[PDB]
Amino acid sequence: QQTTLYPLVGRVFVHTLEPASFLHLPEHAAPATIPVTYHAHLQGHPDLPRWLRYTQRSPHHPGFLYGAATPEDRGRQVIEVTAYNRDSFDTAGQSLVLLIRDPEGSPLPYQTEFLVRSHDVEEVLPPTPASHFLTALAGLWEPGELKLLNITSALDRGGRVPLPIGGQKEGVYIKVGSASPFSTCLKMVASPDSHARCARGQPPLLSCYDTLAPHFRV
Amino acid sequence: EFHMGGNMELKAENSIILNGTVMVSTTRLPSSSSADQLGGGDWVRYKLCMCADGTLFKVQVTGQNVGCQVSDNPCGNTH
Amino acid sequence: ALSQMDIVLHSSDGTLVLDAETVCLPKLLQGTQAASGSSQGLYEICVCPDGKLYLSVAGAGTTCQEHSHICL
Amino acid sequence: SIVVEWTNNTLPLEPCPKEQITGLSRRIAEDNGQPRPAFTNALEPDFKA
Amino acid sequence: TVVGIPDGTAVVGRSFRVTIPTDLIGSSGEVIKVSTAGKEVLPSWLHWDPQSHTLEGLPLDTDKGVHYISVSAAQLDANGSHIPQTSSVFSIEVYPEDHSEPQSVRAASPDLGEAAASACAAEEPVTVLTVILDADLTKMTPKQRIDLLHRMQSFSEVELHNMKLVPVVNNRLFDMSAFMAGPGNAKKVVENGALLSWKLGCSLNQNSVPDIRGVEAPAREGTMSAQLGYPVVGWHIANKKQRPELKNHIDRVDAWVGTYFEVKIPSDTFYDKEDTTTDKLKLTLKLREQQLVGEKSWVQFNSNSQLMYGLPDSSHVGKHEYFMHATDKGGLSAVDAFEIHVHKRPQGDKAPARFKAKFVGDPAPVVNDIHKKIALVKKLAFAFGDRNCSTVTLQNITRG
Amino acid sequence: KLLFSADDNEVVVGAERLRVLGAEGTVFPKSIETPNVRADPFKELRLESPTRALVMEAPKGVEINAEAGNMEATCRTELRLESKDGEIKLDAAKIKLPRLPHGSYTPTGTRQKVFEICVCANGRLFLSQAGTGSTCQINTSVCL
Numbered sequence: 035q036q037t038t039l040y041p042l043v044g045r046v047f048v049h050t051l052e053p054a055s056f057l058h059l060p061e062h063a064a065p066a067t068i069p070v071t072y073h074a075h076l077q078g079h080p081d082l083p084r085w086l087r088y089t090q091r092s093p094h095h096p097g098f099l100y101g102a103a104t105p106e107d108r109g110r111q112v113i114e115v116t117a118y119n120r121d122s123f124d125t126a127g128q129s130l131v132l133l134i135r136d137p138e139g140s141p142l143p144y145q146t147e148f149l150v151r152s153h154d155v156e157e158v159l160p161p162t163p164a165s166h167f168l169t170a171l172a173g174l175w176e177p178g179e180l181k182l183l184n185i186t187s188a189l190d191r192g193g194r195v196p197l198p199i200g201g202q203k204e205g206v207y208i209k210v211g212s213a214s215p216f217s218t219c220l221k222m223v224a225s226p227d228s229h230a231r232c233a234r235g236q237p238p239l240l241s242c243y244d245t246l247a248p249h250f251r252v
Numbered sequence: 253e254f255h256m257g258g259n260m261e262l263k264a265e266n267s268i269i270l271n272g273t274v275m276v277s278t279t280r281l282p283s284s285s286s287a288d289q290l291g292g293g294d295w296v297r298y299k300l301c302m303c304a305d306g307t308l309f310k311v312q313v314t315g316q317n318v319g320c321q322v323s324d325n326p327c328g329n330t331h
Numbered sequence: 332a333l334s335q336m337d338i339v340l341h342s343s344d345g346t347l348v349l350d351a352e353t354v355c356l357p358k359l360l361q362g363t364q365a366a367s368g369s370s371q372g373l374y375e376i377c378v379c380p381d382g383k384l385y386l387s388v389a390g391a392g393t394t395c396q397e398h399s400h401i402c403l
Numbered sequence: 404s405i406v407v408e409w410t411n412n413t414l415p416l417e418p419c420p421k422e423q424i425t426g427l428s429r430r431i432a433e434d435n436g437q438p439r440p441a442f443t444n445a446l447e448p449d450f451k452a
Numbered sequence: 453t454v455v456g457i458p459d460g461t462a463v464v465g466r467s468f469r470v471t472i473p474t475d476l477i478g479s480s481g482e483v484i485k486v487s488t489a490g491k492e493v494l495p496s497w498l499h500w501d502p503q504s505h506t507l508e509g510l511p512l513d514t515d516k517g518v519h520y521i522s523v524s525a526a527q528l529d530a531n532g533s534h535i536p537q538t539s540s541v542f543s544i545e546v547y548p549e550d551h552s553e554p555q556s557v558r559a560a561s562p563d564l565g566e567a568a569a570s571a572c573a574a575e576e577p578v579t580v581l582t583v584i585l586d587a588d589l590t591k592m593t594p595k596q597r598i599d600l601l602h603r604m605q606s607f608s609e610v611e612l613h614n615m616k617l618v619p620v621v622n623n624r625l626f627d628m629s630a631f632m633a634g635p636g637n638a639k640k641v642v643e644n645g646a647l648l649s650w651k652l653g654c655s656l657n658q659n660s661v662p663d664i665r666g667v668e669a670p671a672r673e674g675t676m677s678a679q680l681g682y683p684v685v686g687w688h689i690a691n692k693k694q695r696p697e698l699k700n701h702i703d704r705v706d707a708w709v710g711t712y713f714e715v716k717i718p719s720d721t722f723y724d725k726e727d728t729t730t731d732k733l734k735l736t737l738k739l740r741e742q743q744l745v746g747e748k749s750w751v752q753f754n755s756n757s758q759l760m761y762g763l764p765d766s767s768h769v770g771k772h773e774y775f776m777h778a779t780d781k782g783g784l785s786a787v788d789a790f791e792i793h794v795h796k797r798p799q800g801d802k803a804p805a806r807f808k809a810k811f812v813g814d815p816a817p818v819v820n821d822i823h824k825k826i827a828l829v830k831k832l833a834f835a836f837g838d839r840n841c842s843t844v845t846l847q848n849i850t851r852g
Numbered sequence: 853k854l855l856f857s858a859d860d861n862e863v864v865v866g867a868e869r870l871r872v873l874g875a876e877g878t879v880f881p882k883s884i885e886t887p888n889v890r891a892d893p894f895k896e897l898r899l900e901s902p903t904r905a906l907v908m909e910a911p912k913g914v915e916i917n918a919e920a921g922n923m924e925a926t927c928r929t930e931l932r933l934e935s936k937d938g939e940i941k942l943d944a945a946k947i948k949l950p951r952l953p954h955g956s957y958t959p960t961g962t963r964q965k966v967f968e969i970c971v972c973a974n975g976r977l978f979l980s981q982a983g984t985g986s987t988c989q990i991n992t993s994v995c996l
């Protein structure tokens with residue numbers, strides 16, 4: 035069993051993973067009950083390349099393979115992945131084929147990096163919350179198309195473990211690219227007066243209403 | 253598996269927990285036959301007994317009809 | 332195998348065969364036999380002929396022999 | 404006797420900081436080598452250089 | 453085999469306990485899993501004990517309603533699965549204080565409960581003794597609520613089902629209608645409080661109250677609070693009409709020979725449900741077999757200042773290990789481990805400056821005492837007027 | 853001091869340290885002989901097989917030590933503690949048996965010779981044939 039995917043240099047790639055067809059042994063009745071983890075590596079290697087990484091909140095939750103293609107990794111790439119069921123101890127070897135190619139269309143020089151504090155990484159990884167976040171960002175990106183570039187756990191950059199009391203989330207760093215120029219509100223956000231205010235703990239000078247609210251806290 | 257040649261040592265500070273449907277090697281463990289007529293009669297030997305909270309405790313046996321009922325509970329009062 | 336904390340021999344739903352000539356349990360709590368019962372939930376440990384271990388309700392005398400249904 | 408030796412971390416392993424050491428000598432030391440009144444007061448009373 | 457577990461009834465403040473017939477639901481090797489129907493978490497007022505296979509709890513005022521409980525017997529699979537072969541679902545209905553006496557509650561028991569079956573008249577007020585404690589039922593587990601109930605049982609001589617444990621409403625820590633009252637052993641109140649109440653009789657007067665010395669005396673002397681585990685605010689008779697947790701570790705401590713280092717623990721290093729802060733919790737430093745640092749050791753640590761400090765020597769270059777122990781007011785300790793790397797002085801021998809001085813008196817007590825060494829280092833730092841005493845690196849001391 | 857050699861068996865390089873780059877890992881088709889495997893600081897240690905068995909041997913002893921932690925022996929079929937001629941002990945203040953199943957009573961069931969546990973004075977345990985009453989006062993030669 036193999037599957038061929040088509041990543042491109044410049045933007046993120048994410049693969050939602052379902053135990054229904056990934057595992058050769060079907061999970062009948064309610065398939066969401068069984069906890070299965072996944073260990074993915076380069077073929078004949080113990081770990082994924084630098085650009086690619088893998089996460090999983092809980093074994094009773096789907097894992098996620100995600101990363102941004104690099105121009106130095108262009109070409110054919112082989113992923114050998116093992117579905118280790120946390121309960122059933124059932125080995126399901128699987129091959130994934132990646133063809134890292136150049137992006138098609140205009141580039142996105144205008145990249146923007148944000149920190150989300152109201153959500154975990156595994157919440158944004160499904161396509162629909164990411165789409166909702168990108169539409170909310172387009173609510174302030176008028177005009178211009180959007181395309182996410184990078185997703186990274188805030189704990190990877192060096193953040194501390196949030197307190198489990200108070201609903202505190204780990205946070206996530208998000209890079210989204212666009213060829214459209216930044217908005218005037220975004221231009222005044224980056225002004226050093228707001229940086230000085232943030233250094234004092236004062237709020238940054240905001241002229242546009244937070245479209246991310248109340249779902250997303252940035 | 254744990255295949256050791258000599259003794260196997262399992263030491264803890266607070267407590268041990270053996271969670272599961274435990275078996276035992278009956279042939280390997282010795283069993284006291286009743287051929288001898290009370291060779292260990294009125295002897296200080298303890299019987300293992302089950303607390304309500306999973307704890308085990310040993311009760312000294314005085315006569316032939318000593319059960320596991322206790323008044324001064326070493327398990328602690330079942331709070 | 333010594334540990335500074337609790338040790339969990341967590342067989343989820345399986346069996347635990349302990350194959351040794353001698354089993355030493357020198358650190359058990361000592362119980363005092365009396366007619367009065369401190370509380371309920373008191374049981375005694377019972378052995379099936381195949382090595383299966385179970386429990387019976389504690390009483391004035393032994394109750395392992397009265398509860399031989401589980402042994403098969 | 405207590406024969407004490409030490410080094411300073413701001414020393415950059417570079418061409419001689421002779422001006423810094425001269426300033427320290429005129430600040431806390433003297434040409435004869437006795438502890439200065441400020442240096443002695445800092446040393447006072449546990450240590451007597 | 454489908455097993456029909458009967459529906460259960462619980463009352464706010466009353467101890468609910470049900471025995472699940474696990475022998476019928478689960479076969480040999482099958483282990484029961486008890487949760488909420490369609491959820492992986494039981495309700496916050498319920499606790500399942502696999503030892504006696506018993507679901508017991510105490511519902512609070514926020515737990516009113518019908519709680520559906522799913523009981524599924526997982527079966528052993530050769531490869532490793534645990535298949536819930538038989539899933540039995542039963543509902544538990546929670547009633548407010550408007551529920552009747554536990555006589556209606558005690559509806560599933562061979563015992564008649566004549567003591568419980570005795571009641572008062574419809575117009576006769578019920579004489580109830582209520583003990584006020586300094587505890588929060590929300591922060592306490594239902595297991596801890598049953599703990600409190602059965603610990604008060606040892607002084608009240610009353611069964612668990614006849615007691616009522618409720619939170620204090622509107623910060624009322626005294627009853628004005630009580631004809632008898634007594635102070636507790638708690639001089640201050642931290643939590644909101646808990647009222648644990650049990651009936652003594654029907655409209656009893658002062659001359660008709662039974663012997664309550666075994667309740668009044670231990671509460672005043674504090675032995676009742678010692679056995680309960682929580683402070684006792686007081687008691688009155690009226691005629692009513694955890695272990696700390698860890699989030700962040702200390703990776704390693706970078707130190708250099710002849711250099712003084714000082715580290716203050718972060719405020720988010722450890723957490724407890726009862727404390728929530730590191731500063732309000734006792735912190736100690738220990739060795740591998742739980743021995744403290746000696747007075748002569750090159751690293752010490754002050755608990756009141758929650759500050760570790762030290763200055764290493766070249767005979768102690770390399771790795772070392774230490775444990776941080778975080779003990780709360782509850783007598784429970786959380787543990788973190790950390791490693792310290794001590795390096796040689798990076799500048800080494802090519803330092804552009806070399807200060808040398810000879811003093812008076814034997815250097816044996818000064819070298820033998822790390823306190824004298826750190827005092828000397830900070831005294832040089834103050835002599836230069838400096839704040840960071842680490843800028844001094846002693847290199848060698850010789851007896852003269 | 854030897855700083856390089858390359859002969860018919862092997863090649864010795866006397867470098868102070870061996871420093872490999874690359875986050876993808878490495879492959880050593882034959883073996884690694886290291887006297888001391890140490891975890892990276894601030895990092896976990898993991899000894900796993902992706903799809904197969906793990907076997908580990910030491911004829912002169914194995915010390916598993918949790919200097920502050922737990923020994924979570926999570927299995928699903930058998931936690932075999934098989935000693936050839938030694939013994940097993942559980943040095944702990946309390947002993948828990950949280951999931952030993954109950955045995956329903958047989959007032960008239962078939963007579964099956966169940967067994968009971970008798971404790972010697974040194975904590976040594978031995979079996980005994982169940983009788984009408986407690987039968988842990990028959991023999992002391994096992995305890996002797």
Ligand SMILES: *[C@@H]1O[C@H](CO)[C@@H](O[C@@H]2O[C@H](CO)[C@@H](O[C@@H]3O[C@H](CO)[C@@H](O)[C@H](O)[C@@H]3O)[C@H](O)[C@H]2NC(C)=O)[C@H](O)[C@H]1NC(C)=O
Pocket residue numbers: 044084085102183184185186190209875
């Ligand atoms: C998306 O974000 C990730 C995470 O920040 C980026 O991956 C990071 O990329 C940098 C540089 O490419 C890596 O730094 C390198 O680290 C190695 C040591 O492993 C060091 O030897 C090099 O000199 C360099 O400093 C970093 O390790 C890597 N982190 C992870 C977790 O992969 C990624 O580049 C970002 N991609 C885009 C398109 O923004």
Ligand SMILES: *[C@@H]1O[C@H](CO)[C@@H](O[C@@H]2O[C@H](CO)[C@@H](O[C@@H]3O[C@H](CO)[C@@H](O)[C@H](O)[C@@H]3O)[C@H](O)[C@H]2NC(C)=O)[C@H](O)[C@H]1NC(C)=O
Pocket residue numbers: 271272341342343344483484485486487488492493494499500501502505950951
């Ligand atoms: C010993 O291991 C067994 C195997 O897991 C445990 O048995 C069952 O374990 C599951 C998973 O923990 C329990 O389900 C959970 O129950 C709790 C309340 O007990 C509930 O809050 C969770 O949402 C979840 O449903 C299940 O109850 C339990 N059942 C039985 C009969 O054991 C067992 O708990 C373990 N015992 C110890 C002392 O570790």
Ligand SMILES: *[C@@H]1O[C@H](CO)[C@@H](O[C@@H]2O[C@H](CO)[C@@H](O[C@@H]3O[C@H](CO)[C@@H](O)[C@H](O)[C@@H]3O)[C@H](O)[C@H]2NC(C)=O)[C@H](O)[C@H]1NC(C)=O
Pocket residue numbers: 411412413414423833836837838842843844845
């Ligand atoms: C090692 O020698 C250096 C000398 O280079 C010592 O550092 C010096 O520390 C003093 C503070 O006591 C610094 O004084 C400065 O004064 C200016 C005046 O405006 C002020 O702006 C600064 O904030 C500071 O107060 C001095 O600059 C600094 N020398 C430097 C940085 O080169 C150091 O304390 C010695 N360490 C020992 C003896 O352990």
Ligand SMILES: *[C@@H]1O[C@H](CO)[C@@H](O[C@@H]2O[C@H](CO)[C@@H](O[C@@H]3O[C@H](CO)[C@@H](O)[C@H](O)[C@@H]3O)[C@H](O)[C@H]2NC(C)=O)[C@H](O)[C@H]1NC(C)=O
Pocket residue numbers: 848849850
């Ligand atoms: C720092 O102070 C130390 C100790 O006062 C000095 O090291 C000492 O150096 C002398 C001169 O060699 C050693 O004396 C002889 O050493 C040989 C071995 O090298 C030994 O076999 C002889 O019996 C005799 O002791 C002395 O042992 C040594 N002390 C030590 C190593 O503890 C050092 O020279 C001083 N350095 C500076 C820069 O002041």
Ligand SMILES: *[C@@H]1O[C@H](CO)[C@@H](O)[C@H](O)[C@H]1NC(C)=O
Pocket residue numbers: 839840842843
């Ligand atoms: C004191 O010196 C240390 C060097 O170890 C440096 O890290 C620290 O910033 C200095 N203190 C101040 C106030 O600059």
